[PDB]
């Protein structure tokens, strides 16, 4: 579950 911009 993605909760963040990584780049």
């Amino acid at each position: 579950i993605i909760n963040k911009k990584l780049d």
Partner: antibody
């Protein structure tokens, strides 16, 4: 599950360098993102930055001139260096996995002569 | 950076009653990819923060459905339908659509039992 544990000196003299290490068990640091974040006394959370699966780093521009995050994939460890500390750097320092899913228990660093 | 502000900072709640925490950000968190990276941590006493809610309203794993989240663009709400003892702690909203990631002051939820 992934386990993290930070280690480092609890005491740092003003204008010296703080060094911390995070040891990761259960998965390789060649694969994720590895974050540092801190909690000053009573003053919410402050993001420090990360190192990536590839070694690329991102630093909070509030700190980027004095901060280094590095890694030793042989020991499955990544580390934090914050130079020229002041009492403003007194905090609990946490390491955490990508998306902050897994956390270490934190280590208190006190800046004092 | 993007500023996160929570209200109240202190929230006494009778056991079994509902509880609400509001979070507001100084910028929209709706990214052009359609996602809104407003999230909530729960920091139980003596522990590190843990993921509570991701993307405004998706409950993270192991989180009871008494928790709810809401809002759009700049105004956000954490809700607990019936407060139970395990809810003791500090709650932080944070933001992951702009670098650096930024965190609220935290709201301390104290329980009336």
């Amino acid at each position: 599950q992934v386990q993290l544990q930070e280690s480092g000196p609890g005491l740092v003299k003003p204008s010296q360098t703080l060094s911390l290490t995070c040891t990761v068990s259960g998965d390789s640091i060649t694969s994720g993102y590895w974050n540092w974040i801190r909690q000053p006394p009573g003053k919410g959370l402050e993001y420090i930055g990360y190192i990536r699966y590839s070694g690329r780093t991102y630093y909070n521009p509030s700190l980027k001139s004095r901060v280094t995050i590095s890694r030793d994939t042989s020991k499955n460890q990544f580390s934090l260096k914050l130079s020229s500390v002041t009492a403003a750097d007194t905090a609990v320092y946490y390491c955490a996995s990508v998306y902050f899913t897994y956390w270490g228990q934190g280590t208190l660093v006190t800046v004092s002569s | 950076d993007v500023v996160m502000t929570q209200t109240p900072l202190s929230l006494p709640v009778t056991l079994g009653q509902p509880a609400s925490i509001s979070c507001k950000s100084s910028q929209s968190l709706l990214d052009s990819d359609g996602k809104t990276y407003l999230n909530w941590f729960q920091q139980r006493p003596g522990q590190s923060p843990k993921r509570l809610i991701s993307l405004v309203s998706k409950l993270d794993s192991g989180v009871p459905d008494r928790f709810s989240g809401s809002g759009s663009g700049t105004d956000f709400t954490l809700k607990i339908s019936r407060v139970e003892a395990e809810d003791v702690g500090v709650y932080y909203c944070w933001q992951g659509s702009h670098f650096p990631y930024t965190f609220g002051q935290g709201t301390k939820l104290e329980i009336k039992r």
